[PDB]
Amino acid sequence: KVLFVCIHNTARSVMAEALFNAMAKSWKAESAGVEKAERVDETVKRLLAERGLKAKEKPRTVDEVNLDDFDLIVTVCEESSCVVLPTDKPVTRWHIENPAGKDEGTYRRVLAEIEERVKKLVGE
Amino acid sequence: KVLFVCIHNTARSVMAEALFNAMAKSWKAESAGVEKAERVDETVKRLLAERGLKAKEKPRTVDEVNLDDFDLIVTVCEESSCVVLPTDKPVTRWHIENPAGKDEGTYRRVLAEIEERVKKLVGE
Amino acid sequence: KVLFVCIHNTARSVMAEALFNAMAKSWKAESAGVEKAERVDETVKRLLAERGLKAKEKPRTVDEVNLDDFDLIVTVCEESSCVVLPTDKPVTRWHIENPAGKDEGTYRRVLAEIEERVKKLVGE
Amino acid sequence: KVLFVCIHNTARSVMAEALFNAMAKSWKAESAGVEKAERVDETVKRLLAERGLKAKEKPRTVDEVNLDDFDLIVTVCEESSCVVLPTDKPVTRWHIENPAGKDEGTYRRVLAEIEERVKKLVGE
After folding, report:
1. Which of B78, B83, B100 sits opposite A81 (nearest CB)?
2. How far is Cα D48 from Cα A47, in angstroms, rounded to an integer?
3. Which of A59, B88, C72, D64 could form a disulfide with A37 if both were Cys (CB 3.0 to 4.6 A apart)?
4. Does the keyword Transmembrane helix apply (chains A, B, C, D) (predicted)?
């Protein structure tokens, strides 16, 4: 399995997970965040449900998760601030626009990029 | 000058700046964050005002700031997720408990640590 | 393809490459180093040739190589000094004893670990 | 004190140290390397002795050194491979041409840059 981690873990983290799982046959996916959050984005769960996908029930901080369990932790970084995690394990970095607040169609645009990237990533 | 950067930039980032400036003679300080935030913590501005300190007017993302201007960017990291910045410049990491939400006296405890660390840091 | 990079690129880097290729069906491998080196270790080429493997002809610095070509750059780090490369791409870290100088059977022990790790890594 | 660490620790690491010490009043300096080396460069000790400076007696790997002792570890990185050390402490990165082998006057050129940088760095 792979781990999609972003900062607040409410949208992107959750999007990549759901899309990954709908495309991967053997690999599975989970998500985590650097900081706490109460709810998963409503725009996201709507957008995923519109695609027949259920987002994660509740954001889970990366602290409540033992990283070594994963075999590829993909990190969804900001425009210029990729967070590093405590693992000599394999980890990539995806610079993806933060849809938060922007709402509107920007979320869908973010969804698509994540999809183009997950699709490509699911090559292996 | 030094730059105190944390994720959301609402409390700690702001605390260290204000305390630093009240202790440093020649050096000055600024703060920035990895992600957007509308307001500076009310507990903080209260806590600083109680010490005769005005917190920053509004959180400024590290994106609206050209890092090279600084000479020591101290990064206030989480329990296990120190964010890295785009600079071959000097940067440290302070693992400081996130007071957010916890409110109560936890904030003051966080204030004290930041103070113990800023005081020490102001050695140079 | 995967890229095995170490500092001087004379032994381990070269070992992992040759073993990987002898085990991977679809993926291929290459190697590179942080600093220049004139010759590939004689102990290694002997040790690989003893296993029917030809080591790389000459060490190639990671500078003479465009990283983006690869899809997983595994970094063979020291006891406490994992070098980071200029890529938002996926990269792991293997703490492997430096056989250099130690010669004797230590090289073979290093060969075995790299093999245990490559074998495992070739899972995907 | 500050710590100047490079890969092999034979030239640059040693140059910065000696120059630093000849310029700093209160701060002191030491050097360390990522990998073992038997001798300190002869071009360097000549070059420093020509300036009335004695280079380090023998290269000391960063492993034989407890990092926390220092208060600013400057890392002399390559064209594209800055090594990271095991410390949440403050550390910078200097991209300095590797004089090794090039010999000739290139060493002096490297000496000068390090000097321009140490001079500047000794501001604090």
Report:
1. B83
2. 66
3. A59
4. no
Query: What is the distance of C-alpha D87 from the center of its chain?
Result: 18
Q: Do C85 and D85 touch (CB under 8 A)?
A: no
Provide the 10 A C-beta neighbour count for residue C91. 23
Given a contact cutoff of 8 angstroms between Cβ atoms, the answer to whether D94 and D75 are in contact is yes
> One-letter amino acid identity for D64?
E
Helix, strand, or coil (residue B57) = coil
| Structure-solving method | X-ray
CB D8, CB D40: distance < 8 Å = no
Resolution limit, Å: 2.8
Q: Are C47 and C18 in contact (CB under 8 A)?
A: no
Give the catalytic positions of D in this structure: 6, 77, 82
Contact present, A7 and A33 (Cβ < 8 Å): yes
The per-residue DSSP string of C63-104 comes to: GGS-GGG-SEEEEEE-SS-PBP-S-SS-EEEEE----TTT-T
Contacts with D100 from chain C: Cβ below 8 Å: 35-36
Residues C6, C11, C32, C114: which is the catalytic one?
Answer: C6
Which residues have CB under 8 Å from B2's CB, separation 6+? B20, B27, B28, B29, B30, B70, B71, B72, B73, B74, B121
Chains that touch A (3 or more CB pairs under 8 A): B, C
B5 bridge partner residues: B32, B75
Q: At what angle do helices A106-121 and A42-49 cross, to 10 degrees?
A: 60
Say yes or no for a CB contact (<8 Å) between A100 and B7.
no
**Which domains, ranges and CATH numbers included, belong to chain D?**
1-124 (3.40.50.2300)
CA–CA gap between residue C29 and residue C5 (Å, rounded): 11
Mark which residues 43-102 of D lie under 8 Å from C by CB.
62-63, 78-86, 98, 100-101
CA dihedral A77, A83, A88, A91 (to 10 degrees): -10
- 3-state DSSP percent of chain D in helix, strand and coil, to 5: 35, 20, 50
Question: Which alpha helices (DSSP H) does A22-105 contain, by range?
Answer: 42-49
Say if CB D5 and CB D85 are below 8 A apart: yes
Sheet with C72-77, strands from edge to edge, namely A29-33, A2-6, A73-77, A91-95, C91-95, C72-77, C2-6, C29-33
Task: Sort D28 into a burial class: Cβ within 10 Å, 0-12 / 13-18 / 19+.
Answer: exposed
* Minimum distance, in Å, between the CA of residue B25 and any CA atom of chain A: 31
With CA atoms as reference, the chain A residue closest to C122 would be A124
Token duo for residue A61: 């901080």
Whether residue B114 contacts residue B42, with contact meaning beta carbons closer than 8 Å, is answered with no
